[PDB]
Amino acid sequence: AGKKVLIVYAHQEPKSFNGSLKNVAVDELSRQGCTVTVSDLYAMNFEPRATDKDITGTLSNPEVFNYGVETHEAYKQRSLASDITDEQKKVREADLVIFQFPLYWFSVPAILKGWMDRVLCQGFAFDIPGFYDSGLLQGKLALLSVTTGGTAEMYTKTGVNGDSRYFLWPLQHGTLHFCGFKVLAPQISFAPEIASEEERKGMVAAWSQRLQTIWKEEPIPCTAHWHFGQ
Amino acid sequence: AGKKVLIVYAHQEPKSFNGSLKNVAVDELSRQGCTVTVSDLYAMNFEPRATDKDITGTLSNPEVFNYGVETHEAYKQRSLASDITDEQKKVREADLVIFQFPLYWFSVPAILKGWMDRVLCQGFAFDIPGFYDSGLLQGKLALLSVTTGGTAEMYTKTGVNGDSRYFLWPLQHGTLHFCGFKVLAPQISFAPEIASEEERKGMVAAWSQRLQTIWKEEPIPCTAHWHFGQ
Numbered sequence: 418a419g420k421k422v423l424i425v426y427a428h429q430e431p432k433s434f435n436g437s438l439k440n441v442a443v444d445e446l447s448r449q450g451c452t453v454t455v456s457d458l459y460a461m462n463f464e465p466r467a468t469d470k471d472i473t474g475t476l477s478n479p480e481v482f483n484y485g486v487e488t489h490e491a492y493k494q495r496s497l498a499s500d501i502t503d504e505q506k507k508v509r510e511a512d513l514v515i516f517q518f519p520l521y522w523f524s525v526p527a528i529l530k531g532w533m534d535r536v537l538c539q540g541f542a543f544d545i546p547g548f549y550d551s552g553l554l555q556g557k558l559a560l561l562s563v564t565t566g567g568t569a570e571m572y573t574k575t576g577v578n579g580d581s582r583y584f585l586w587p588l589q590h591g592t593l594h595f596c597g598f599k600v601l602a603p604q605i606s607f608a609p610e611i612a613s614e615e616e617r618k619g620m621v622a623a624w625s626q627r628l629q630t631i632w633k634e635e636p637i638p639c640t641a642h643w644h645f646g647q
Numbered sequence: 648a649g650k651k652v653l654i655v656y657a658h659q660e661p662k663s664f665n666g667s668l669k670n671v672a673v674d675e676l677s678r679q680g681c682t683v684t685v686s687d688l689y690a691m692n693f694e695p696r697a698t699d700k701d702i703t704g705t706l707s708n709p710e711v712f713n714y715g716v717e718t719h720e721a722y723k724q725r726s727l728a729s730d731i732t733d734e735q736k737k738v739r740e741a742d743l744v745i746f747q748f749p750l751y752w753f754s755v756p757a758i759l760k761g762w763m764d765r766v767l768c769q770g771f772a773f774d775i776p777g778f779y780d781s782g783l784l785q786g787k788l789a790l791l792s793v794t795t796g797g798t799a800e801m802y803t804k805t806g807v808n809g810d811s812r813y814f815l816w817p818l819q820h821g822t823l824h825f826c827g828f829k830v831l832a833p834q835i836s837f838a839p840e841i842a843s844e845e846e847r848k849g850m851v852a853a854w855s856q857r858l859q860t861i862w863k864e865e866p867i868p869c870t871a872h873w874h875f876g877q
């Protein structure tokens with residue numbers, strides 16, 4: 418239907434398993450008639466570092482540079498670097514934002530971490546006050562589509578890595594929910610490097626198949642209990 | 648004595664509160680006679696992105712780029728980029744690695760996330776298999792010194808942000824413990840931007856005091872129970 422989707426994609430190799438997941442999302446959401454944009458961060462050589470090059474006008478406090486303060490002001494003044502505001506426009510217009518990435522150290526690859534750090538600035542994505550359920554991106558859906566080295570077995574409460582939900586907290590709750598997104602259940606594609614060719618094909622078609630009905634899903638309850646239980 | 652400390656620091660501003668915490672750690676550990684090295688990531692313009700530039704000469708599969716495989720082989724064949732190997736030398740010789748950074752999105756700034764992604768490579772920090780305590784950095788101590796925007800009250804189990812310990816999991820357990828580090832209790836300096844003056848002087852003083860007996864400390868039990876349990 419009449420919806421805009423932004424896919425923020427973080428993998429170096431177009432032939433990868435992540436590449437395939439990205440392309441099947443674009444294929445399926447495009448088939449449905451959705452408007453689809455992809456920010457392919459490596460191909461863009463997206464700048465991950467939060468630096469004073471991100472503000473182009475007079476700083477509030479040139480004596481002691483505080484990145485959150487300076488970017489909050491710059492956002493209000495329209496003196497942010499244009500790579501940041503280009504991304505903000507995509508997010509602003511999106512109804513759904515999908516993040517497609519390999520798990521790096523229980524988190525996103527740094528190039529995508531730098532997208533969150535630099536694009537979700539104060540004034541745009543949240544304000545103090547104006548976060549979690551009062552976040553500035555309220556009304557928008559977000560979803561993490563994550564691939565791993567580790568097996569599903571390894572990511573259980575009594576497996577070596579602990580439950581997969583534990584590493585989702587800082588991203589789902591600390592970032593997405595904080596900015597006001599409603600979070601859809603994560604898509605985790607476990608261990609495609611270990612998986613057989615039939616199992617890989619299965620994981621790709623499960624994602625394609627889930628996307629056929631993605632607009633009918635409810636968000637998760639993004640709370641400590643969902644993530645950690647008890 | 649004789650101990651070597653590496654401090655991996657990630658703040659843009661030498662006059663910041665992180666800056667002061669890094670400086671008192673250098674001052675105190677230097678005073679004790681320890682060997683100290685600092686990796687000032689922003690001043691080094693450290694590269695955060697995981698790309699094929701990290702491998703010199705020629706790829707072990709130039710048709711499909713797999714970062715994990717390529718860096719593992721590059722490590723074995725002494726063909727990693729020199730920014731990464733310079734960091735690996737400092738880590739290899741270190742008895743204690745302290746990370747000094749402001750919390751960005753429940754995690755490390757992207758520039759320090761990229762140090763983790765690119766420096767802690769397979770063959771160096773862990774093997775597959777070969778992790779947690781068959782992790783290659785066993786014997787070394789690691790410590791997170793983190794500063795926050797949010798007050799300690801916000802970081803309680805039924806505060807908005809949830810417990811501090813919940814966001815420590817991917818860093819302490821998924822990264823530091825996985826590589827074989829023993830983890831010291833984190834130093835968390837809550838909300839300096841809204842502290843006095845005193846209080847702030849006091850937080851800087853307390854870190855210095857703690858570093859006086861850092862070598863007497865016992866590592867935390869780095870378990871799901873410690874982070875999430877009761």
Ligand SMILES: Cc1cc2nc3c(=O)[nH]c(=O)nc-3n(C[C@@H](O)[C@@H](O)[C@H](O)COP(=O)(O)OP(=O)(O)OC[C@@H]3O[C@H](n4cnc5c(N)ncnc54)[C@H](O)[C@@H]3O)c2cc1C
Nearest residue numbers: 433434435437519520521522523564565566567617715764
């Ligand atoms: C710095 C670093 C940190 C990491 N940290 C962690 C961690 O904390 N936890 C953890 O679990 N893992 C971790 N990993 C490993 C893991 O997340 C990755 O290896 C990744 O998830 C695998 O995804 P990929 O797309 O790169 O796989 P690929 O290697 O690209 O996929 C396996 C492939 O199937 C492919 N394929 C592509 N398209 C298709 C298709 N359409 N159908 C069938 N097969 C297809 C390829 O041909 C290849 O055989 C880390 C890796 C690195 C480099």
Ligand SMILES: Cc1cc2nc3c(=O)[nH]c(=O)nc-3n(C[C@H](O)[C@H](O)[C@H](O)COP(=O)(O)OP(=O)(O)OC[C@H]3O[C@@H](n4cnc5c(N)ncnc54)[C@H](O)[C@@H]3O)c2cc1C
Nearest residue numbers: 485663664665667749750751752753794795796797847848
């Ligand atoms: C992209 C981004 C994401 C963020 N995400 C989060 C998050 O997830 N959770 C969260 O809680 N917060 C978050 N924050 C807020 C961030 O963690 C805090 O802004 C930061 O930790 C403050 O530390 P600082 O060193 O920059 O403080 P500074 O602004 O540098 O310091 C505060 C004050 O201390 C003064 N000072 C310096 N040295 C001394 C000294 N020796 N004695 C006394 N005073 C001194 C400085 O002059 C200044 O007045 C985020 C910020 C950004 C920009």
Ligand SMILES: COc1cc(=O)n(C)c2c3c(ccc12)OCO3
Nearest residue numbers: 566567568571578715775821825
């Ligand atoms: C430290 O987290 C990991 C957990 C983990 O379970 N696996 C399988 C990893 C992996 C890597 C790199 C890291 C991890 O390359 C291939 O498999």
Ligand SMILES: COc1cc(=O)n(C)c2c3c(ccc12)OCO3
Nearest residue numbers: 485591595752753796797801808
């Ligand atoms: C989870 O993210 C935050 C939690 C949080 O508790 N606080 C206070 C934050 C903050 C930021 C940015 C993010 C956060 O700028 C100043 O204060």
Ligand SMILES: [Zn+2]
Nearest residue numbers: 590594639640
């Ligand atoms: Zn939440």
Ligand SMILES: [Zn+2]
Nearest residue numbers: 820824869870
């Ligand atoms: Zn652990």
